[PDB]
Write an enzyme that holds these catalytic residues in place. Structure first.
Site, mmCIF file in Angstrom:
data_model
loop_
_atom_site.group_PDB
_atom_site.id
_atom_site.type_symbol
_atom_site.label_atom_id
_atom_site.label_comp_id
_atom_site.label_asym_id
_atom_site.label_seq_id
_atom_site.Cartn_x
_atom_site.Cartn_y
_atom_site.Cartn_z
ATOM 1 C CG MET C 41 1.567 9.728 -5.635
ATOM 2 S SD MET C 41 1.959 9.150 -3.973
ATOM 3 C CE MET C 41 2.055 7.384 -4.240
ATOM 4 C CG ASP C 42 -3.926 13.474 -7.383
ATOM 5 O OD1 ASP C 42 -4.584 13.424 -6.323
ATOM 6 O OD2 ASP C 42 -4.020 12.613 -8.282
#
Ligand code: 3PE
Ligand code: 3PE
Ligand code: 3PE
Ligand code: PLC
Ligand code: PLC
Ligand code: PLC
Ligand code: PLC
Ligand code: PLC
Ligand code: SF4
Lengths: 141, 60, 95, 291, 55, 235, 136, 126, 506
Positions: C41-42
């Protein structure tokens, strides 16, 4: 005392109120005779609430604080006091001086509650906000 | 004079790292109010589409 | 009445279900599963998951916690410690 | 400011400061056993609750609900035109007021920059659209000062004469509408006939009842028609009685004083700091007048 | 203690609404005065040679 | 009479039935506040007049004023009754329910066509009723202004013909109409001469001023009647 | 003839003088109502801005039928002095249907009364119920 | 030390200015404010500052007038800067300005010079 | 005296400024009023003169020797209660200022005392309804006197609804009697005692049974007593039972004229259930006031057995039991208020929250009282052993006299059950004693510098500063020794109960 005439009047009054609504429902031209924008149940831009032009938050079922709630509550004991004076109105002569003194003592007790409300300032409107001036003091060293 | 609801004091951030946090904090506030946006304005789209729209504008 | 009824296993079970509705790298999620590395996840993807987890448990992560959370277990710990039932009207309780 | 675990945009958990000793209670027991022996089943028993709701630090998640938000919007007689006055009401008491403006924003200042100084003058008639000639006068004075020119003596008197006729017109609109909003309808009708007489003076010298582009940079558009001063004077001999009759219903009325005395008090210190001027400034004890 | 009017005098005005009846009387005076209304379009308001209308 | 009028207050508060209109809601709160103001004051003033005649019959009250109109002995009560009548009908200076400059139209802001007419009709029917009541309680109701003039006009007609009773009904109601039209004029007169008073000021006005005065009179009147051996009876 | 109190700009001042004692619109049966429910005439007296246009449409839609709209002044007719402004609607007819246009800046109190007379002349020529008998 | 001094009274007889009340001790308050103002100048602001030179000139003049006139009206009629209640406010504000001036170090060189094209209007340099 | 002085206190309290000192001094004025009321009542009312029974106020009220004794008891117990709010109970402002915060505290008490005294004297069904509402309304106001407390307002809301239903039942019973007979005076109704539906009087008793927390209506009483503040629970859990039980005895006295066996069985059925709930209910509880609420229910059941029998021995049993139980009730609550000064201060597990309204809320908060104050602990032990029924304390003779009336009238089942219930209730009674003393020898060599009393500053380090104020400590000392040393004067006190007559004569 005969009240048959009164009963007919009460019947007519009830029927009279429905005539105003019935006349208005049968006199207005149909929507198709007008601009034909359809039924009011579909014209949501018309059946919506009025907020002076700009729609706002919908707070139909939000609580409404009341600043005179104590005055509203104090109405009930005083309303009963006034109602309890009705028996003395039509029996003032038969009770004579004895009933007059009893009627005065009855009011002399409720006047204590009236005095108590005056001193407690319970009839004033309650406010959340308070406006107090603050003196400016300098902590000179 | 009291500022209106959800009013922030304008400030010039001189740190790039601090600015990133403020954007992330504001990004979550948009997502949390997505359902409120649907309810208040009576939109024809679900709150999921609103959050997709918010993400697209932030990614620009 | 107004008390938490959550358990560590139930909170973890519902946390995994929410995170499996996204495009995460792995469907094997536990307490030690990290968002950045294991889930891939960014910045924006992580905040989408955090808000989605907020909706499930009706809790709101603070700014400091959300900007420093690393693993799913930290999310589980936050939910257990901070969750409260929403206050009901007067009629719901005493009637 | 910032989202915290005890305060966010949707709810809050308020805990008042404790006003009692932090009493230590240990080893809770009943006649049959310890608390830990029955704590599993104690959730069905209200008599076994260990938290008192009267405690200042009792946790309660309360949803943040906005106050009564009333829009004193454009379609409201109280607003003198277009105004979205957003009020945060607790019942009827005002907690916070957000005046939303720009509903009459027409970009006058932007449009002026595309017009010559003569073409830009009629825009000022439509800013304070009851005191029209005073609006022209301030712009005329600014251009005259920039032009390094001086109006002749008769021109100055004309702008002074119609400057105060304009002031009477504005106060007739201002005071009577203020009294009309409170509930005094009759003084509004009495004074609006005096406006008709004074607006006839506007139309006689300019041809426009309201938007009279008469005061211009460098003097006035045209000279006074013959007989105007006699008509102005004849109105002047009578206008004194109209003011007295207006004061008969307002000045000494106990209802009117209960609606105005103590309402909207402004200190002299705060009036200056908020840029208040005119009657707003002079009401707080500061004798300042631009004239 | 420095009031010019006695308490009975101030109470008589207050209880009997002295200024309210004064305001009522002034309003009744206008009821017996000529109104200002003109009957447009049968009658027209004043006009001047400088008036601006249709081109 | 008093019981029937109190029912009309319930009709006004019905419009604000969890309504989505914020201006309708604010009027209902003001409407209840006004009722608390006048209801105690209005009821007690009527009871004093009934106590003076020892009767709760309106027609008996009218006939009891043959020698004296109750405006003279009870001038303060007539003013108080009229003030309460203005408050009851939500007429200015007590027009807080339908203040155009405060609540656009009050509870009628969402009403149109027949619902508006019925409310408009009911409000003006109360104005006529309260104006007629003032003529009844303090100005003798239908009793003639001059007894001599009443006899002279009726002496022109034969009592053996129906024309006498047609004229008699015109005169007696004409006496009531003239007195009632004066107070209907006064209802308009006060509207054109006084600004509107805030409803919270009205609450303090009735409880601090009107109620002590009317309760004082309800004690004063029996003391006078008993002192001079003039306690009232019905005949 | 019950118009709605919808004063926007300087055109409203002339609309107030129609209610002034000199003209006394109430003598013709004209009463201004604060609510769209109780009014059948919408007089657009002032400038209509883009920020104001959605509010004007909502208020117009809240008027029960039959309803008429009067456009008074150059602002409401075609924008007038602010025709080339970035925030001004060039004519209220872009939002609501207009039955009569009153020219002037501002139109005089007699100019507005003449426009009302024209509308009343149009209203007296309505054949709503005879249309049902002959045209439907 | 702790010399707590009243600047603006929140109660008392009005002065004719809304929100400004009469000061219970007009003369003693000004004397302490003036003397404290003079001491603060000599400890924070250097001698070459024009601001320090000007403040000492008029603070001493206002201090001499207060210490030689018992009548409140005569004090105002010679200082000519409003009522004494207003003078106390002015003395407090001037005292606080000296503290801000010391932190600003407003007697040094121009902290930021303007650009060459900065104060030029339509080709003419002001 | 009560009515006239109450009006003066009402006006005076609203005139003087709001302060804790003035409220406390006004509370002392109320103490003088009740003392003056007792002196006046004792001057004119005597046991011998009232033996026949004297009607008052157009026969609306009827006073006899049985009624007069309870009125004197009501005034005396009210005097001891006012001492709590008229003087210091702990000497600490943080604790004691709660009693001085509400000015109308003494006013509401005086309102309720008038209702309490007149209730046993009612001789008409109309005045019965009026007085029972006068007493009920005053109790609702006292329960809600602390309007800033969430529990106090919640309890008063619960109290109002339950009592209003009971008042409706009482009104419904009196109206049904009027429909059958057309008479409102009780003595006139007694002429038709054999021709009216006697179960309508059972409906009247059902309304009265609700107001005293009798089963199956026990649940609301336990909840209200535990949530209400200790100073409020001390009054509302005892005073209503003083008057209503006396009235129930009079009504049962009239019912026994026809001797309806079906009526007795229904009341016996409710007494049987109340003994089961009263005994087993308090076995698993952790709150002291919850424990006392079950104790109150059980003891009322014991008195109802005497009331149900309604014989000569019942008068002796009821009068003695109600007097000694009230003294024990006052003594226990007086000790509970005082011993709050020995609570440790935190400086956590179970997140226990204790408020200023109920500083003592759990049974285990009484730990180490044997070490903290040996004399106070023994005083509590004597009171608890009296509730158990250990002879020769006052509690044993109360149960001894109740058993005499029950077994004489043939209530063998109830007498055996009441003794099994007494043994079951001894379990939770002994738990209080276990907490006080059973850990004395292990905690004797312990250090407690964190107690509440330790926060009290010393005067000069040489003055002998007592830990407890003079008045409250003396009351506990007096009541404890009366309970302990009743054997000295037991014979004469019962002889006084011999002379209390309810239309016995000969
Ligand atoms: C509808 C039924 C009729 C209802 C209306 C009834 C009308 C009758 C009203 C009767 C009551 C009126 C009382 C008027 C006399 C008392 C008032 C008075 O005289 O003044 C109060 C007086 C104080 O003196 P003061 O007024 O201050 O005089 C100095 C001011 N420069 O105080 C005093 O010195 C004496 C104290 C008063 C004694 C008399 C009472
Ligand atoms: C205060 C205590 C005052 C005791 C007064 C007792 C009393 O009221 O009189 C006895 C009463 C019967 O009296 P009677 O027969 O009508 O007339 C003859 C009286 N010699 O019989 C009764 O009804 C009284 C029943 C109640 C008995 C209460 C016993 C005393 C209670 C303990 C007192 C503790 C004192 C604490 C002191 C605190 C101040 C420091
Ligand atoms: C020699 C000396 C003798 C001294 C003692 C004399 C008396 C001895 C009494 C013997 C009976 C009690 C002893 C046996 C009971 C054991 C209870 C029990 O085992 O569990 C409780 C039982 C439910 O069973 P459970 O909870 O699932 O336990 C697992 C069992 N495999 O729960 C139940 O099912 C019990 C039935 C329901 C409750 C019935 C209650 C009705 C009243 C019972 C009598 C009480 C009388 C009290 C009288 C005064 C109060 C009115
Ligand atoms: C008292 C006032 C009298 C004057 C106005 C009378 C109006 C009623 C006549 C009318 O409405 O006539 C026109 C009608 C139908 O045409 P519509 O417009 O669609 O009817 C709409 C009216 N509904 C709702 C009754 C259908 O014709 C008929 O067959 C009338 C039967
Ligand atoms: C008869 C029954 C109908 C009228 C009842 C009410 C009348 C006024 C009662 C209080 C008077 C008062 O208080 O009088 C005092 C005041 C003011 O005088 P002042 O300030 O003391 O003057 C100063 C001292 N001088 C007197 C030396 C100059 O007088 C008034 O304002 C009188 C009002 C008169 C106009 C209205 C009268 C007609 C009313 C409308 C028709 C119903
Ligand atoms: C014994 C003789 C009894 C007399 C009976 C009549 C009493 C009338 C009320 C007197 C008190 C009063 O009007 O009071 C005024 C009150 C409250 O004012 P306040 O807040 O106390 O300030 C004033 C006190 N000062 C000066 C000490 C601070 O508000 C009002 O303005 C109410 C205005 C109601 C106007 C209604 C008139 C309608 C027309 C009536 C004519 C046909
Ligand atoms: C306030 C004035 C009231 C008023 O003018 O009314 C009082 C009087 C009359 O009524 P009266 O004398 O009280 O009794 C009735 C007397 N008859 C029998 C003559 C009707 O009116 C006029 O004579 C005018
Ligand atoms: C001769 C006749 C005249 C006697 C006057 C006596 C006045 C006494 C007084 O007003 O007593 C004074 C007290 C307390 O006043 P306060 O505002 O608390 O403080 C006083 C002012 N301070 C703060 C500066 C100290 O008022 C009261 O008790 C108010 C209740 C009075 C009765 C209210 C009801 C009226 C009903 C009338 C019958 C139906
Ligand atoms: S048309 Fe002219 S008078 Fe009317 S609003 Fe626009 S600028 Fe004002």
């Amino acid at each position: 005392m005969l009240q048959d005439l009164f009963n007919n009047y009460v019947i007519l009054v009830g029927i009279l109120g429905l005539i105003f609504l019935g006349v208005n429902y049968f006199i207005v031209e149909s929507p198709r005779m007008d601009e034909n924008n359809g039924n009011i149940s579909d014209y949501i831009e018309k059946s919506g609430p009025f907020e002076c032009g700009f729609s706002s938050f919908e707070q139909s079922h939000n609580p409404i604080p009341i600043a005179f709630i104590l005055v509203a509550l104090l109405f009930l004991p005083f309303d009963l006091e006034v109602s309890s004076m009705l028996p003395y109105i039509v029996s003032i002569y038969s009770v004579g001086i004895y009933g007059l003194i009893i009627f005065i003592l009855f009011l002399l007790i409720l006047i204590v509650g009236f005095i108590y409300e005056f001193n407690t300032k319970s009839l004033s409107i309650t406010t959340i906000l308070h406006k107090k001036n603050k003196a400016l003091v300098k902590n000179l060293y | 004079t009291n500022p209106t609801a959800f009013a922030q004091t304008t400030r010039y951030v001189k740190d790039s790292t601090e600015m990133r946090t403020l954007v992330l904090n504001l990004y979550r506030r948009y997502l949390r109010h997505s359902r409120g946006f649907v309810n208040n304005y009576n939109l024809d789209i679900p709150a999921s589409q609103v959050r997709t729209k918010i993400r697209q504008e932030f990614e620009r | 009445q107004s008390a938490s009824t959550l358990t560590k296993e139930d909170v973890l079970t519902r946390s995994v279900s929410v995170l499996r509705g996204f495009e995460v790298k792995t469907k094997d999620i536990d307490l030690q599963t990290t968002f950045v590395q294991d889930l891939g996840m960014d910045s924006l993807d992580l905040n989408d998951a955090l808000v989605a987890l907020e909706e499930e448990f009706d809790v709101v992560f603070d700014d400091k916690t959300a900007n420093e959370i690393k693993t799913v277990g930290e999310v589980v710990d936050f939910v257990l410690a901070n969750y409260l039932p929403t206050e009901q009207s007067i009629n719901h309780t005493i009637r | 400011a910032a989202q915290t675990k005890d305060n966010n945009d949707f709810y809050d958990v308020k805990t008042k400061k404790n006003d009692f000793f932090p009493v230590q209670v240990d080893g809770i027991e009943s006649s049959l056993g310890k608390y830990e022996e029955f704590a599993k089943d104690a959730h069905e028993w209200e008599s076994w609750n260990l938290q008192n709701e009267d405690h200042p630090e009792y946790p309660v998640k309360r949803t943040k609900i906005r106050h009564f938000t009333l829009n004193f919007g454009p379609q409201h007689p109280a607003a003198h035109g277009v105004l979205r006055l957003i009020l945060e009401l607790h019942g009827e008491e005002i907690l916070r007021s957000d005046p939303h403006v720009g509903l009459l924003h027409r970009g006058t200042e932007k449009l002026i920059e595309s017009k010559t100084y003569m073409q830009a003058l009629p825009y000022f008639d439509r800013l304070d659209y009851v005191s029209m000639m005073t609006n022209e006068q301030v712009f005329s004075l600014a251009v005259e000062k920039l032009l390094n020119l001086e109006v002749p003596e008769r021109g100055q008197y004309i702008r002074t004469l119609f400057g105060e006729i304009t002031r009477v017109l504005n106060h007739l609109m201002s005071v009577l509408s203020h009294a009309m909003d409170v509930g005094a309808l009759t003084p509004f009708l009495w004074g609006f006939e005096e406006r008709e007489k004074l607006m006839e003076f506007y139309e006689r010298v300019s041809g426009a009842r309201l938007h009279s582009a008469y005061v211009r940079p460098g003097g006035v558009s045209q000279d006074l028609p013959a007989g105007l001063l006699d008509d102005i004077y004849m109105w002047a001999t009578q206008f004194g009685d109209r003011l007295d009759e207006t004061e008969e219903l307002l000045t000494d009325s106990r209802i009117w004083k209960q609606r105005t005395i103590g309402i909207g008090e402004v200190t002299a210190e705060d009036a200056l700091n908020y840029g208040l001027s005119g009657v707003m400034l002079r009401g707080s004890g500061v004798p300042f007048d631009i004239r | 203690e420095e009031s010019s009017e006695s308490a009975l005098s101030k109470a008589t005005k207050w209880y009997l609404l002295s200024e309210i009846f004064r305001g009522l009387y002034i309003t009744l005076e206008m009821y017996f005065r000529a109104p200002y209304t003109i009957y447009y379009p049968f009658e027209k308001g004043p006009v001047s040679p400088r008036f601006r209308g249709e081109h | 009479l008093l019981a029937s009028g109190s029912i009309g207050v319930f009709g006004t508060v019905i419009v604000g039935w969890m309504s989505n209109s914020k201006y309708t809601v604010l009027a209902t709160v003001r409407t209840t506040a006004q009722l608390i103001s006048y209801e105690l004051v209005l009821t007690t003033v009527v009871f004093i007049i009934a106590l003076i005649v020892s009767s709760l019959n309106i027609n008996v009250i009218i006939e009891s004023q043959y020698n004296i109109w109750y405006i003279i002995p009870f001038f303060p009560l007539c003013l108080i009754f009229f003030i309460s009548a203005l408050a009851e009908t939500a007429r200015p200076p007590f027009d807080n329910v339908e203040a155009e400059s405060e609540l656009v139209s009050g509870h009628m802001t969402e009403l149109s066509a027949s619902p508006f007419v019925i409310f408009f009709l009911s409000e003006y029917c109360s104005m006529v009723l309260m104006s007629t009541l003032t003529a009844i309680f303090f100005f003798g109701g239908y009793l003639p202004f001059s007894n001599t003039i009443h006899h002279l006009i009726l002496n022109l007609f034969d009592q053996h013909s129906i024309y006498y009773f047609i004229i008699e009904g015109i005169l007696l109601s004409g006496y009531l109409a003239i007195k009632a039209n004066f107070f209907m004029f006064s209802f308009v007169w006060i509207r054109a001469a006084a600004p509107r008073l805030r409803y919270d000021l009205l609450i303090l006005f009735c409880w601090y001023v009107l109620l002590p005065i009317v309760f004082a009179i309800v004690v004063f009147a029996p003391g006078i009647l008993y002192c001079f051996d003039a306690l009232p009876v019905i005949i | 003839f019950w118009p709605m109190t919808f004063g926007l700009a300087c055109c409203a001042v002339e609309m107030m003088h129609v209610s002034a004692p000199r003209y006394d619109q109430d003598r013709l049966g004209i009463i201004f109502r604060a609510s769209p429910r109780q009014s059948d005439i919408m007089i657009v007296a002032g400038t209509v801005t883009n920020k104001m246009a959605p509010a004007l449409r909502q208020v117009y839609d809240q008027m029960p039928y039959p309803r008429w709209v009067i456009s008074m002044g150059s602002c409401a007719n075609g924008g007038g002095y602010y025709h080339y402004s970035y925030s001004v609607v060039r004519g209220v007819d872009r939002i609501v249907p207009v039955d009569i246009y009153v020219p002037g800046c501002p139109p005089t109190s007699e100019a507005l009364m003449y426009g009302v007379f024209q509308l009343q002349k149009k209203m007296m020529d309505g054949q709503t119920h005879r249309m049902w008998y002959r045209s439907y | 030390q702790a010399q707590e001094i009243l600047i603006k009274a929140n109660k008392g007889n009005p002065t004719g200015l809304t929100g400004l009340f009469q000061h219970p001790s007009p003369r003693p308050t000004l004397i302490t404010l003036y003397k404290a103002t003079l001491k603060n100048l000599e400890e924070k602001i250097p001698k070459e500052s024009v601001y320090r030179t000007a403040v000492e000139a008029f603070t001493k003049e206002r201090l001499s007038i207060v210490e030689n006139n018992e009548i409140i009206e005569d004090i105002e009629k010679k200082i000519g800067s409003g009522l004494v209640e207003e003078l106390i406010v002015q003395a407090n504000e001037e005292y606080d300005l000296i503290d801000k001036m010391a932190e600003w170090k407003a007697w040094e060189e121009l902290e930021e010079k303007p650009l060459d094209d900065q104060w030029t209007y339509f080709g003419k340099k002001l | 005296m009560l009515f006239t002085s109450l009006l003066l206190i009402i006006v005076y309290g609203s005139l003087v400024n709001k302060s804790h000192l003035l409220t406390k001094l006004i509370n002392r004025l109320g103490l003088i009023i009740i003392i003056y009321t007792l002196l006046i009542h004792l001057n004119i009312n005597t046991l011998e003169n009232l033996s026949i029974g004297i009607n008052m106020f157009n026969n609306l009220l009827l006073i006899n020797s049985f009624n007069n004794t309870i009125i004197e008891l009501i005034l005396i117990i009210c005097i001891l209660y006012v001492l709590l709010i008229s003087f210091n109970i702990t000497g600490l402002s943080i604790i004691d200022n709660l009693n001085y915060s509400k000015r109308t505290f003494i006013v509401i008490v005086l309102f309720n005392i008038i209702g309490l005294t007149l209730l046993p004297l009612v001789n008409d069904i109309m005045i019965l309804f009026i007085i029972i509402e006068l007493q009920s309304y005053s109790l609702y106001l006292l329960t809600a006197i602390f309007n800033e407390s969430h529990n106090s307002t919640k309890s008063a809301l619960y109290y109002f609804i339950v009592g209003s239903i009971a008042s409706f039942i009482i009104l419904d019973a009196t109206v049904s009697i009027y429909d059958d007979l057309g008479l409102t005076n009780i003595q006139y109704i007694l002429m038709y005692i054999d021709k009216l539906e006697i179960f309508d009087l059972l409906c009247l008793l059902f309304g009265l049974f609700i107001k005293i927390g009798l089963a199956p209506f026990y649940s609301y009483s336990i909840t209200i007593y535990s949530l209400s503040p200790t100073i409020i629970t001390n009054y509302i859990s005892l005073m209503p039972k003083l008057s209503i039980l006396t009235l129930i005895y009079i009504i049962m006295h009239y019912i026994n004229i026809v001797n309806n066996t079906d009526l007795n069985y229904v009341i016996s059925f409710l007494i049987l259930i109340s003994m089961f709930i009263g005994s087993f209910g308090g076995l698993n509880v952790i709150r002291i006031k919850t424990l006392l609420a079950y104790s109150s229910l059980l003891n009322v059941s014991y008195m109802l057995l005497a009331i149900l029998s309604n014989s000569n021995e019942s008068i002796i049993a009821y009068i003695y039991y109600i007097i000694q139980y009230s003294l024990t009730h006052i003594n226990i609550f007086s000790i509970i208020l005082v011993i709050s000064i020995y609570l440790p201060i935190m400086n956590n597990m179970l997140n226990v929250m204790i408020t200023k309204y109920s500083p003592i809320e759990y049974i285990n908060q009484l730990k180490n009282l044997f070490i903290n104050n040996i004399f106070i602990a023994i005083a509590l032990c004597i009171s608890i052993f009296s509730l158990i029924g250990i002879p020769p304390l006052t509690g044993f003779y109360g149960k001894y006299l109740v058993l005499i009336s029950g077994l004489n009238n043939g209530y063998v089942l109830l007498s055996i059950v009441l003794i099994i219930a007494s043994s079951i209730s001894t379990v939770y009674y002994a738990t209080i004693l276990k907490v006080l003393s059973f850990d004395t020898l292990s905690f004797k060599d312990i250090i407690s510098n964190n107690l509440i009393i330790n926060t009290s500053p010393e005067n000069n380090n040489n003055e002998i500063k007592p830990e407890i104020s003079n008045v409250i400590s003396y009351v506990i000392s007096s009541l404890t020794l009366i309970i302990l040393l009743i054997i000295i004067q037991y014979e004469n006190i019962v002889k006084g109960a011999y002379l209390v007559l309810l239309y016995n004569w000969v």
